[PDB]
């Protein structure tokens, strides 16, 4: 049913279960910056860092996208996917403004059942309808090699543990 | 359904834009602070609903800045800028541009608004967004003007919209 994360300590309900090491991750379809629909299966044979966050237009989500963008640079055989409920238009504005060329931004504009399938759908309170903060790392065939449902939404995910799984 | 266009290409929009004489449906949308704001909260005020695809595209942005300059001369009126942008996008924009008169609302929640107001882009690349539309409401939520813009890359008719307020 639900996971519990927090916002400045206040409990926030998140539906489903974040995928765990060993699970087969579900194929999903999300909206890329040209408004085309992009399936996880398009990335077959590459590893995938899914950096999931509430919104690129808030501060800690923006920090995680700069960070992963800088880290994507020296990753081997990996795509870094920045995923949220932002419209594709916000996401590309931010990456265009900040010179963040490595990440691929994807929106739940369409393909929203993703939130449900990846256990990141906030279901209650002022954040209901946004994704929680999470990192999922997937191998070339979409097996989970790492995941972290960030306990406190006002803190950044653990970048080093996430990318360790790629080594 | 209804058809409008984007660079000449038909785009279907579900529902039917309310027409003069109709009682507009009571919506609840998401304001900048993530609180849920009902149309009824604006009782006794006229409302200009500026509905567009996204504030982070150029035509939508031009209409928010125009309605915002026009909003300052309006009597007994609130100007609601409505889209499927997240509240955060709407707030970033209005704060960066000094656009302090409009009230932004998002379909983050309260998404039945799109259907109820005949503005839900149904198929194609724009699916999940609102079409471009202006609905003007009286103090009691009757429709005094509406336009479903025929071509999405053109601005709405500001002057006709606001005439209905005089």
Numbering used by the authors:
A (entry chain B): 1 to 167
B (entry chain A): 2 to 167
What does the primary publication say about this deposited structure?
Tpx constitutes part of the bacterial defence system against reactive oxygen species (ROS) and, correspondingly, is upregulated when E. coli is exposed to oxidative stress. Tpx contains three cysteine residues, two of which (C61and C95) form the redox active disulphide bond. ypTpx has a regular thioredoxin-like fold: a seven-stranded β-sheet, with β2 and β6 running anti-parallel to the rest, although with an inserted N-terminal β-hairpin (βN1-βN2) absent from other peroxierdoxins.
Crystal forms 1 and 2 grew in conditions containing DTT, and the solved structures were in the reduced state. The six chains superpose well, with root-mean-square-deviations (r.m.s.d.) of less than 0.5 Å. There are no salt bridges or covalent bonds between the two dimers in the reduced structure. The redox active site of Tpx is made up by CP and CR (C61 and C95 in ypTpx, respectively). The partial unfolding of α1 opens a cleft in Tpx formed between the loops connecting β1 and α1, α3 and β6, and β7 and α5 on subunit A and connecting β1 and β2, and β4 and α2 on subunit B. When in the reduced state, C61 is orientated into the pocket where it is available for oxidation by H2O2 or alkyl peroxides. During transition to the reduced form, the loop containing G59 to C61 folds into the binding pocket predicted to accommodate the compound. In fact, MOE Dock as not able to find a suitable docking pose for the reduced state of ypTpx, presumably because the binding site is occluded by the folded extension of the α1 helix in the reduced state.
